[PDB]
Amino acid sequence: AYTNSFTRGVYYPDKVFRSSVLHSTQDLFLPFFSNVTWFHAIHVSLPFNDGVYFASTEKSNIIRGWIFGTTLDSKTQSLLIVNNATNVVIKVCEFQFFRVYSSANNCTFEYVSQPFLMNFKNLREFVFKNIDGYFKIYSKHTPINLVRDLPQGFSALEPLVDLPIGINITRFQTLLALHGWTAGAAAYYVGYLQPRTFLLKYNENGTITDAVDCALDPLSETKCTLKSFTVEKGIYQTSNFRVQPTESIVRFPNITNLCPFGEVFNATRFASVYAWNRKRISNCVADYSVLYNSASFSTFKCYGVSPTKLNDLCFTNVYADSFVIRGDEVRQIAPGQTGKIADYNYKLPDDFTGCVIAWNSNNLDSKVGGNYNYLYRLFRKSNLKPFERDISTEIYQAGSTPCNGVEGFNCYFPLQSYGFQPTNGVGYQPYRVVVLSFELLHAPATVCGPKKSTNLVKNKCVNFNFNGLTGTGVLTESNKKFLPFQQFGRDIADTTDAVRDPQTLEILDITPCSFGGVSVITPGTNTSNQVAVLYQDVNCTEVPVAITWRVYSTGSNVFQTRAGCLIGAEHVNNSYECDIPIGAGICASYQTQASQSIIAYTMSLGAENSVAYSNNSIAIPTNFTISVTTEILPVSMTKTSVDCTMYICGDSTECSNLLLQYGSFCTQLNRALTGIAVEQDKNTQEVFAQVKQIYKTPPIKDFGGFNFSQILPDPSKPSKRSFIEDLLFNKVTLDLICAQKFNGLTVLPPLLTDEMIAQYTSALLAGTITSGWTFGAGAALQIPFAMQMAYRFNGIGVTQNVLYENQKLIANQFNSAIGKIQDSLSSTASALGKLQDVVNQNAQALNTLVKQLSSNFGAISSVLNDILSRLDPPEAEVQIDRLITGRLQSLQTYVTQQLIRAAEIRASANLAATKMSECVLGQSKRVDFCGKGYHLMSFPQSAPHGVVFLHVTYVPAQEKNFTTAPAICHDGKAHFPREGVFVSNGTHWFVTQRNFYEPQIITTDNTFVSGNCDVVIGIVNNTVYD
Amino acid sequence: VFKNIDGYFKIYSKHTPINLVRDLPQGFSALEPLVDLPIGINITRFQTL
Ligand SMILES: *[C@@H]1O[C@H](CO)[C@@H](O[C@@H]2O[C@H](CO)[C@@H](O[C@H]3O[C@H](CO)[C@@H](O)[C@H](O)[C@@H]3O)[C@H](O)[C@H]2NC(C)=O)[C@H](O)[C@H]1NC(C)=O
Ligand SMILES: *[C@@H]1O[C@H](CO)[C@@H](O[C@@H]2O[C@H](CO)[C@@H](O[C@H]3O[C@H](CO)[C@@H](O)[C@H](O)[C@@H]3O)[C@H](O)[C@H]2NC(C)=O)[C@H](O)[C@H]1NC(C)=O
Ligand SMILES: *[C@@H]1O[C@H](CO)[C@@H](O[C@@H]2O[C@H](CO)[C@@H](O[C@H]3O[C@H](CO)[C@@H](O)[C@H](O)[C@@H]3O)[C@H](O)[C@H]2NC(C)=O)[C@H](O)[C@H]1NC(C)=O
Ligand SMILES: *[C@@H]1O[C@H](CO)[C@@H](O[C@@H]2O[C@H](CO)[C@@H](O)[C@H](O)[C@H]2NC(C)=O)[C@H](O)[C@H]1NC(C)=O
Ligand SMILES: *[C@@H]1O[C@H](CO)[C@@H](O[C@@H]2O[C@H](CO)[C@@H](O)[C@H](O)[C@H]2NC(C)=O)[C@H](O)[C@H]1NC(C)=O
Ligand SMILES: *[C@@H]1O[C@H](CO)[C@@H](O[C@@H]2O[C@H](CO)[C@@H](O)[C@H](O)[C@H]2NC(C)=O)[C@H](O)[C@H]1NC(C)=O
Ligand SMILES: *[C@@H]1O[C@H](CO)[C@@H](O[C@@H]2O[C@H](CO)[C@@H](O)[C@H](O)[C@H]2NC(C)=O)[C@H](O)[C@H]1NC(C)=O
Ligand SMILES: *[C@@H]1O[C@H](CO)[C@@H](O)[C@H](O)[C@H]1NC(C)=O
Ligand SMILES: *[C@@H]1O[C@H](CO)[C@@H](O)[C@H](O)[C@H]1NC(C)=O
Ligand SMILES: *[C@@H]1O[C@H](CO)[C@@H](O)[C@H](O)[C@H]1NC(C)=O
Ligand SMILES: *[C@@H]1O[C@H](CO)[C@@H](O)[C@H](O)[C@H]1NC(C)=O
Ligand SMILES: *[C@@H]1O[C@H](CO)[C@@H](O)[C@H](O)[C@H]1NC(C)=O
């Protein structure tokens, strides 16, 4: 039987308390939704690889006992756990498989301890792990409902005990004791752990409440990468994919330059004993396999080198000595061994980096009468130096008297050769011995081996090697024309691009295994859980054959695009607004095409339109909308202060004295940050403090129907802000601050408090609504808001009569616009994106800075205190200086990023100051500067580290067609409109303003004369009143 | 071209026909490598036979 493990196989990774923190771990866990074996134990009257997760839900404690080992037959040590009524007993010994075991031999360690395990069934979760000879056991007891077959539910297993088990473990078994055998059946669950990366969520109590398997599905991969349980709708770049190579191929030239070492093995007569000949070969190829294949031998023992080792080791100055010796003298030449021949004929150095090969030579050297030609000398002045030969025939005085002349009593220089006979000498028969030594100690290398190659593969990623040039990828037919001296080809980027086969002189291109970006496209995690996967710049004929999660690699949804391919969304022919941009004009959405799914499509650039252009057709608007639009501008950012001493050094005197050497760097960093903070204050002053005096709105708020109650301050609230200002303040969200403060990263408060910023804004509002643009230039001059509105209308080329004749309508439009602003700000949280993401950037920068303190930067650890405690000053300081360099580099990176961010914030603040000067303090003519349409006025509103402009704009609407002429000819002379345009309703002609349909009688006042009507193209005929 | 670097003695050569207007005419050509020998001896002075 089998089933799926939903949320089981989770434990506390280490004995450490945490709280309200999402922690990422890499350890042995049971993967989520895994193939868990449902065992049933029934009587008729398992491999332990990378830990085991064991679950039991049976009653009456029926399942009692565990076995772990490699053989479990008392040949090798075994681990056994057994439980009964009162306690639990553990052994690690060789038990012969008390019905459990027969005999106890070689027993070394046993453990006796507290009990572990004490119709609603209960789960008894156990986890067994074995790492570097340490066996950790984890457990948990959880009563549940009846049956439920591994229900939905999460809980982690606390550790109980760890065992120092020093034996290889391969298989584990369960045992149980039963009460004539009673018939019975039971059930348990077995799961296998893998090296996985998990994300654990800790509650306020520090209990692991929930987990995410990062390496299960793309959605959980995005969850683990963002370190959050909720993922906002969009596209997120996850870990990069690379198709792995298939095999390894090695290419070398054909076999050349052979060592003729067979001939010296096949020599008719070998070198003498006392007069051994020394020989050296180099610059060829030798093998040991063929050496004992062609020339078989049985008497050989080698010192310091493995028989297989000689084949791959590359010689320059190898010493070879071959001679015929007696079988009993074959083993006597070993260094430090005493003997007549060793001390007076030939011996090897103590540091003999070599080995001996011996074989029989009786049948090739011995005669019937004996070979009396292998003469030697078992007499010398002393123990001769290693690798020395002597042929000087000086008489040796062996006896007590100076034996001189031809001979003496038992005195002679040479000795008669051994009676070398085939059968008579049992171990005295001659043997040929060759001693090969390789005490090289030299730069050149000559004699290594044929350096064997393998078969050639093509059109497939491989680990290719060409005469030491190593790489990975596919090979293809080469169009390059090499030259005989050229071997491989490089490109502009100094990388290998084409290589020639050293065996046969054919050349192939090199292209490493195709790869690209992996992106996950998701809607809101709350909205849905199905995701799409984008493979960037990879042809998706390759990923399906590349089928760690590869479930989606052979999905029925594949769409190919310029950006790459998309899997998990269906391409559709119709075009919508872009929601999630994919790239190269492809956008993804989540909709029902009634079941909802992810789709991909070509983005629409807006509704198709054809402007009704003609010779003489104009469209004139007859109505307008007073559109009030919010423009959010960041003005300042959180003024940050950092002290080197607190951050870089954990209040250590030694670290402080080592850091004082970098005083220049620290003063530069402090100067840069102080400059940034003073610049933030200057930004706020330049944007807001543009008024010499603080103006006050009158108690009578009568502005000809315009209602400024939502933007003017309300005395009720303690901080005298407005309704809209309060909404903006609530929308932006401004512990980790305590940790930042404790690590020496402080936030200096702005010079201007939110109260005085609101007071500056209120002064600007009062000046704007009571004086208009005049308070910007010089002394504030009072003017009714109606006539200021008439002036703003006159500014955009609309005659002031329009506003006075529609005063109530414009006032109602403005009020409804403010109402819509209030509703939009109250409803959605996406309004103040810019200020919120600025705050998020600053918070992320500070969090990254605090997190880099965990990096060791190649030191022993990331904490100075343990370094000081565990190290004597010199090694302590040689670690601490590296740590200081790392942390100073992190601080420099932070300060540089802050300088660039402060430059962009200063650009935004200069733009905000320009907008306050040109939109608030006056009416701007710059198109689309102070909002979309014809700008009328603006209202500043303070917001957390920024400003909001309520750009009031005139937008024409309800346009209609008219017939138009460039000029009028009345009395043979052309007439032109003073300021407006000629239009005809079909019968009569009229002069009108260009932004509001208002026809007027064509008279001498609104028109001026110029030349005659035979030059202007498109002039028409009409009459002009005096 | 005769070189010796890290005990490795390298020979480069090239063969060109000329009308023998005069010694070392105007022209461009490179010397393709022929043989490198791992000699590893001291070279300071050289002579032509
Ligand atoms: C220019 O556009 C104005 C709207 O942008 C438009 O105002 C609209 O006028 C109509 C009729 O005068 C109103 O319609 C409603 O009138 C009353 C409420 O006052 C209702 O009882 C009726 O049933 C009807 O629904 C609109 O309410 C009003 N819109 C606004 C925002 O006030 C002007 O009339 C237009 N001017 C010209 C010259 O076309
Ligand atoms: C300017 O606009 C203001 C908001 O649109 C408006 O204030 C609003 O006034 C109305 C009635 O005058 C209030 O409506 C509520 O009045 C009482 C309050 O106890 C309730 O019992 C009623 O049921 C009703 O809900 C709004 O509460 C009030 N809104 C705010 C935000 O204060 C001003 O009156 C407008 N200015 C002028 C001159 O009229
Ligand atoms: C195009 O514009 C024409 C010029 O304004 C317009 O003609 C005008 O039409 C109105 C009635 O629709 C006339 O108004 C007078 O009508 C009678 C005439 O006897 C009087 O008794 C009334 O009291 C009223 O004053 C205008 O007299 C007339 N303009 C002229 C100069 O005669 C056309 O109707 C417009 N046509 C279209 C299709 O838009
Ligand atoms: C964290 O543990 C505390 C106990 O130390 C929990 O507080 C009690 O929880 C029980 C069961 O949930 C309630 O019956 C009590 O009313 C709680 N006591 C108090 C004073 O609130 C607390 O609920 C746990 N928190 C979480 C998130 O599980
Ligand atoms: C897969 O890789 C590229 C990328 O799609 C393929 O190149 C396209 O091939 C199709 C059909 O032959 C053409 O219509 C496109 O114009 C090609 N585009 C580009 C950018 O090259 C290529 O044919 C496929 N196979 C291989 C081996 O690359
Ligand atoms: C001005 O007149 C033109 C043409 O007389 C109008 O354009 C037509 O609009 C209708 C529906 O909007 C289409 O079915 C026609 O194909 C259009 N014709 C042309 C030639 O473009 C235009 O709508 C009129 N202007 C306004 C503001 O309505
Ligand atoms: C505007 O009216 C004038 C006359 O009042 C037109 O001028 C005449 O045009 C015709 C045809 O080209 C000529 O035969 C006459 O000789 C012109 N008379 C004069 C006095 O110039 C003129 O054509 C009209 N405008 C247009 C655009 O037709
Ligand atoms: C579990 O594995 C067995 C054999 O290894 C297989 O027969 C069975 O279908 C698998 N079950 C699941 C749910 O994958
Ligand atoms: C449990 O078993 C141990 C030995 O394995 C023994 O010492 C102990 O007496 C047993 N207790 C009971 C209650 O069976
Ligand atoms: C294991 O026990 C056997 C007795 O059968 C003994 O010969 C051997 O020396 C023991 N080995 C160890 C390592 O204790
Ligand atoms: C290597 O030997 C093979 C086997 O016949 C031959 O085809 C190939 O041409 C040889 N290459 C060289 C460089 O000798
Ligand atoms: C996700 O949707 C739920 C309702 O289904 C809503 O309560 C929640 O606010 C949404 N998430 C976010 C981040 O707004």
Ligand SMILES: *[C@@H]1O[C@H](CO)[C@@H](O)[C@H](O)[C@H]1NC(C)=O
């Ligand atoms: C888009 O239209 C073409 C023909 O115009 C058709 O072949 C194709 O199947 C359509 N796309 C989809 C996703 O059905």
Ligand SMILES: *[C@@H]1O[C@H](CO)[C@@H](O)[C@H](O)[C@H]1NC(C)=O
């Ligand atoms: C626009 O005026 C020119 C001037 O001669 C004329 O040729 C053209 O036909 C006119 N356009 C149309 C659409 O009639």
